[PDB]
Amino acid sequence: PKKTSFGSLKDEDRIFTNLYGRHDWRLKGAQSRGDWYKTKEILLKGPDWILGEVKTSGLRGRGGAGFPTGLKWSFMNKPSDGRPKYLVVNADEGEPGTCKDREIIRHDPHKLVEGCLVGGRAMGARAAYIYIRGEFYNEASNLQVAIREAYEAGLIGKNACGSGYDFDVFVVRGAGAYICGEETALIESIEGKQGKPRLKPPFPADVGVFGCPTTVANVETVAVSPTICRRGGAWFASFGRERNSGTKLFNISGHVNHPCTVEEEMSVPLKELIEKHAGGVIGGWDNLLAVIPGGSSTPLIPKSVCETVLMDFDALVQAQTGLGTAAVIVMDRSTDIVKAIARLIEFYKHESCGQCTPCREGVDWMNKVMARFVKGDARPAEIDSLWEISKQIEGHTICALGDGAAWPVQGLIRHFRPELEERMQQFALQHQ
Amino acid sequence: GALFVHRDTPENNPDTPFDFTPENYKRIEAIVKNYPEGHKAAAVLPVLDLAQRQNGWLPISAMNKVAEILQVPPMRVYEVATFYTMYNRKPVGKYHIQVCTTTPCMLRNSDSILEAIQKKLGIKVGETTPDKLFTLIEVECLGACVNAPMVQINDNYYEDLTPKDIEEIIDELKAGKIPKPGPRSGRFSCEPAGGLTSLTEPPKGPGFGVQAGL
Amino acid sequence: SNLIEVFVDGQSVMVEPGTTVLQACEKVGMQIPRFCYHERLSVAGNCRMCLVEIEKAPKVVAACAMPVMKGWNILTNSEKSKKAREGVMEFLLANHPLDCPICDQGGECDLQDQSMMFGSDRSRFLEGKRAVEDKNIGPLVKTIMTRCIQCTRCIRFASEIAGVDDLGTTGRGNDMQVGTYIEKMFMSELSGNIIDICPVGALTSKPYAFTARPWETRKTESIDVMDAVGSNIVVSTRTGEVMRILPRMHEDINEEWISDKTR
Amino acid sequence: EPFDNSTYRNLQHHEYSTYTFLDLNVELSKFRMPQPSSGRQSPRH
Numbered sequence A: 001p002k003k004t005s006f007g008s009l010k011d012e013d014r015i016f017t018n019l020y021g022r023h024d025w026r027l028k029g030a031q032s033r034g035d036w037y038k039t040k041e042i043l044l045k046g047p048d049w050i051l052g053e054v055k056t057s058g059l060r061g062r063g064g065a066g067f068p069t070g071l072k073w074s075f076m077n078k079p080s081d082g083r084p085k086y087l088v089v090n091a092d093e094g095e096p097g098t099c100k101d102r103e104i105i106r107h108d109p110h111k112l113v114e115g116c117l118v119g120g121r122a123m124g125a126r127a128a129y130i131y132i133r134g135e136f137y138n139e140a141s142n143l144q145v146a147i148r149e150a151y152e153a154g155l156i157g158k159n160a161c162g163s164g165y166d167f168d169v170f171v172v173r174g175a176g177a178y179i180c181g182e183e184t185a186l187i188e189s190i191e192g193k194q195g196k197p198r199l200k201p202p203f204p205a206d207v208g209v210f211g212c213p214t215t216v217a218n219v220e221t222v223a224v225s226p227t228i229c230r231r232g233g234a235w236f237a238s239f240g241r242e243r244n245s246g247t248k249l250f251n252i253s254g255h256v257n258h259p260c261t262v263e264e265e266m267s268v269p270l271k272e273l274i275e276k277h278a279g280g281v282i283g284g285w286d287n288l289l290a291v292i293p294g295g296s297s298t299p300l301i302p303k304s305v306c307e308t309v310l311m312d313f314d315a316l317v318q319a320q321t322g323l324g325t326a327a328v329i330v331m332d333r334s335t336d337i338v339k340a341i342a343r344l345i346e347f348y349k350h351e352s353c354g355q356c357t358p359c360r361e362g363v364d365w366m367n368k369v370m371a372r373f374v375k376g377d378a379r380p381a382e383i384d385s386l387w388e389i390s391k392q393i394e395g396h397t398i399c400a401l402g403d404g405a406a407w408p409v410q411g412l413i414r415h416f417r418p419e420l421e422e423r424m425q426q427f428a429l430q431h432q
Numbered sequence B: 001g002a003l004f005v006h007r008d009t010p011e012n013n014p015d016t017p018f019d020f021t022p023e024n025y026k027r028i029e030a031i032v033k034n035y036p037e038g039h040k041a042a043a044v045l046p047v048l049d050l051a052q053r054q055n056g057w058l059p060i061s062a063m064n065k066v067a068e069i070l071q072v073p074p075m076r077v078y079e080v081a082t083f084y085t086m087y088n089r090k091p092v093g094k095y096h097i098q099v100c101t102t103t104p105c106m107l108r109n110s111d112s113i114l115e116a117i118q119k120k121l122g123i124k125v126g127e128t129t130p131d132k133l134f135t136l137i138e139v140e141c142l143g144a145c146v147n148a149p150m151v152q153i154n155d156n157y158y159e160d161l162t163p164k165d166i167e168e169i170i171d172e173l174k175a176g177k178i179p180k181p182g183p184r185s186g187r188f189s190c191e192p193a194g195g196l197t198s199l200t201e202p203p204k205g206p207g208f209g210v211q212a213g214l
Numbered sequence C: 001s002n003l004i005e006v007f008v009d010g011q012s013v014m015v016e017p018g019t020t021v022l023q024a025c026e027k028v029g030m031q032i033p034r035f036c037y038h039e040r041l042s043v044a045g046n047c048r049m050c051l052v053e054i055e056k057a058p059k060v061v062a063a064c065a066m067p068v069m070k071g072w073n074i075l076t077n078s079e080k081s082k083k084a085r086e087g088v089m090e091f092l093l094a095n096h097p098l099d100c101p102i103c104d105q106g107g108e109c110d111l112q113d114q115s116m117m118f119g120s121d122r123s124r125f126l127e128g129k130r131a132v133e134d135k136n137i138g139p140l141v142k143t144i145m146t147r148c149i150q151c152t153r154c155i156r157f158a159s160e161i162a163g164v165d166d167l168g169t170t171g172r173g174n175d176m177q178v179g180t181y182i183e184k185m186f187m188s189e190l191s192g193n194i195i196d197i198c199p200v201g202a203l204t205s206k207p208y209a210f211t212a213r214p215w216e217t218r219k220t221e222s223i224d225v226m227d228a229v230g231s232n233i234v235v236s237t238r239t240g241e242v243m244r245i246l247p248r249m250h251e252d253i254n255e256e257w258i259s260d261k262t263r
Numbered sequence D: 001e002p003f004d005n006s007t008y009r010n011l012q013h014h015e016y017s018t019y020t021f022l023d024l025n026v027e028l029s030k031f032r033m034p035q036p037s038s039g040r041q042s043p044r045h
């Protein structure tokens, strides 16, 4: 009837079966692994049926925010006012701890291409723009080899798959900016400007890239869709809990015996992931200090919280953190957590686009303050100031980079204030 | 330094000789036709990247050439040049060593790789070797966090380095030959080092979990 | 007759669709704080000084860029709106130079006035401030660029009103700087208008430098005779001496601009 | 033909060059649809 322990996903129900590149990644291998199967029928069922199945699966955003996919994709169901419509696949993957998108674009690129076709048909888009980060040169070239095979086989382009739908897939490499993972900053980076995010009340579904209706989607969100439509949608919904449904790619990095990328059933306990797939934290589970669950934006949790937490959006939101990109960065007890969070804040300072005052000035301010916190060169009355500054950045910026910089600070202050004050007191004792 | 104001030098000035080779102009033409008519300013980033891949870096003459080719204002090309960190507005070495030093790589001792590089090259972070073969900088996340500390030399990823593997990579780099990218340990791409805790069975054939008529 | 009904602190106003929160507050006589927003320029929405609370909405909105919705109640003086303004002003003043006595903007700044009216009265910034090198864009505009708050008003004006795409931003983050990258003059008949739109002393008039303070000048409203446009101007005088020329708004003739010969 | 999850199958990117991606784009220009047009040649036109 119902599930209560959402783990131990089998190989049969894993979407990304060429995750480690141990099979052919080209068209011939991908076809034998189920790809590009009855795509003509999926397209001919119509956009309404495809979107209905994407809603039935309960799939949410796999690139952070986790907004439901079927509802987001249905903003394009409107009739055309003359302007073109595009699907913009987000392949930037700039979040520290996250390397899951990199693995699809080079070992299952045809999954991404056919997901582009299925989704763009669902949104009624003429072309797909895959914006990959410029650092993924080999992955981008693998993706474009796959796109070339899809074109030469008639699966993309004129009369795509025999459906009569005309669809193009263009790859546009980035040039070294993490802010270009943000959907509107990505849009403006496609348009040849600085990667600065736009103010939202004009939404990408109305005014997107080139000023046309667009939907920006993560690589995994796009790539799972052909298996969602071809396997049932109900089949996808039978994995994980309610709301947060399906399966996810997990990046386990940090103080782990076997850091790895694995596909595990959603709502999996963090313990099962770390022990079964990652081989456990070095020194055992007793040696665990924090774990950052969903990439650098998601605030850390302590070992007590991480002891009995489940890996989905709702369970991790209950734990004052987020699921983010399902990039778990575990830290053993031999870790300077203040140094780690200061390094993350330094990353966010280096990646701020500088457009808006709170991110531009405040993230730099928080980096300056956190650098002192590593040395202890501060008074304990500055911790509350750091909290207030982070809340002043949070909810006051154009994009979510300010929020994702303020959140690691809050997660450090929330669970490791004694360590910060201990460092400050040691510094006061050393420097009289 | 990385200053965001240009100053003319006898090497970097508007009259610095730069132009695209005919093959690069054909590649530019293929790039320009990827975007709708009236919106070809969307090609500034890839055309600038082609300028960098031909010349090695971006002199101000290359920026002006891209602006002329796309009929965008030069200041618009200047903004893109100074915003995206992959654009070399100063010459770099033959091999641009880029070591990731953010937290997931730092926890795997990315500093033991940085110190080995600084010891072998006899150079610091942010400067080139006198033979103009290696430039060393610290970069943010490169999307390879699962692999132990990694570097990007030019276009390739060298992963899970020990303070000895990067020495060998630099040794064969100085010997001219290019090294095989990827993880230098026994693992292949991103799987667990002890064995596959995941897909280990023949993948299902085409049309396995289908429904009705799809 | 297609006007929608919105509320500004409970008071109902009827606005055309597409009217922003800032404009809806403007028609009840309430001026939302702003730095980057100019009504004659495009909307940027970057300074975040116009953030305001929509009743029942957890997240503040940029009043300058957000179109009003039917039934919205703008809370222009709620505590959340005041705290947003105080945080934004704190961030604006974190790296701002302590140049008020030596800066020509002092006494008619905007940063000063909105710090007094909407920000806190004290600092908790305990670090070293930013400093950027000056840019030379001709003999008319003195760019003390470390006073710049990156509102992009000059860039938007130069690109749209003046039609010259010389101004811009280089770099990103905290070290993103407004300028021309290259050493280049900002020559245009309308170049001197980026001085007035600049909210701070980042862009100042070279001829007027160090010469007068705003409070001591007498303002005579007159007409320009350097051309046949008849631009409306204000003549600043002090102790019987003409001090400078400023634009005087006339929507039908010159709006709020004058040419460099007029100025 | 048999199961071969004991070997990497992504060895092509070892032989990629500086112009592999752009050459692939060039060869891709063959089969694309005609781009849409906004009517003008540039927003400054």
Ligand SMILES: Cc1cc2nc3c(=O)[nH]c(=O)nc-3n(C[C@H](O)[C@H](O)[C@H](O)COP(=O)(O)O)c2cc1C
Residues within 6 Å of the ligand: A060, A061, A062, A063, A064, A065, A066, A067, A090, A091, A092, A093, A094, A095, A178, A179, A180, A181, A182, A183, A184, A216, A217, A218, A219, A221, A222, A399, A400, A401, A404
């Ligand atoms: C700073 C920043 C970086 C982001 N980077 C990425 C990224 O690399 N990949 C991604 O898929 N989404 C990224 N996102 C999230 C996108 O903005 C967007 O919400 C998402 O791509 C939408 O598609 P989804 O609903 O399928 O996730 C980023 C967001 C922010 C604020």
Ligand code: SF4
Residues within 6 Å of the ligand: A179, A196, A197, A351, A352, A353, A354, A355, A356, A357, A358, A359, A360, A397, A398, A399, A400, A401, A402
């Ligand atoms: S939050 Fe930061 S990255 Fe996002 S628009 Fe504002 S300044 Fe740019």
Ligand code: SF4
Residues within 6 Å of the ligand: C096, C097, C098, C099, C100, C101, C103, C104, C105, C106, C107, C109, C110, C111, C112, C147, C199, C200, C201, C202
């Ligand atoms: S611009 Fe305003 S706040 Fe800044 S120094 Fe000048 S008078 Fe003071």
Ligand code: SF4
Residues within 6 Å of the ligand: C147, C148, C149, C150, C151, C152, C153, C154, C155, C178, C197, C198, C199, C200, C202, C203
């Ligand atoms: S120079 Fe003045 S007008 Fe231009 S961005 Fe800076 S503060 Fe705004």
Ligand code: FES
Residues within 6 Å of the ligand: A095, A096, A097, A098, B100, B101, B102, B103, B104, B105, B106, B140, B141, B142, B143, B144, B145, B150
């Ligand atoms: S942390 Fe070094 S690659 Fe992402």
Ligand code: FES
Residues within 6 Å of the ligand: C033, C034, C035, C036, C037, C044, C045, C046, C047, C048, C049, C050, C051, C062, C063, C064, C065
């Ligand atoms: S005035 Fe609306 S953000 Fe600057």
Ligand SMILES: [K+]
Residues within 6 Å of the ligand: C105, C194, C195, C196, C197, C198, C199, C200, C201, C202, C203, C204
């Ligand atoms: K000014």
